[PDB]
Amino acid sequence: SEIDVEIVAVEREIWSGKATFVFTRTTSGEIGILPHHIPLVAQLVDDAAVKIEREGSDDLWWAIDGGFLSITDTKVSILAESAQARADIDEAKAKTDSGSEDPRVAAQGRARLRALGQTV
């Protein structure tokens, strides 16, 4: 079995497919999801980072901007303001974004930084 993960944004969809293991961060801390659990609904943090693992393929590090995780019997949809790929993120832009004083900017930069390798 696998985990159906679909990263959708209020403006457009980013990714959609199956995974072997996925981890996300919400107001209740970080949590892991497997392809054999029960439904669930949690709200991701501002600088939340989702890690979608692929069976046989390298995981996908993406940054979510205030998104929400919704797990079902055999489906997992993630709705957020927007998403960003670790390969598209820039160590410079991430640092600056996190350096900003604004809440939105600080969130994006923090989320992108995490996907890059940063923590908290």
User: Which residue carries 């919400």 as its tokens?
Assistant: 26
Technique that determined the structure: NMR
Compute the distance between CA of residue 112 and CA of residue 48 in angstroms, rounded to an integer: 9
Compute the distance between CA of residue 35 and CA of residue 16 in angstroms, rounded to an integer: 15
- DSSP calls for the chain: --EEEEEEESS-EEEEEEESEEEEEETTEEEEE-TT---EEEEB-TT-EEEEEETTEEEEEEEESS-EEEE-SS-EEEEES-EEETTT--HHHHHHHHH-SSHHHHHHHHHHHHHHT---
Q: Using an 8 Å Cβ cutoff, are 63 and 89 in contact?
A: yes
Compute the distance between CA of residue 65 and CA of residue 83 in angstroms, rounded to an integer: 6
What is the β-pairing status of strands 49-54 and 76-80? unpaired
Compute the distance between CA of residue 64 and CA of residue 38 in angstroms, rounded to an integer: 23
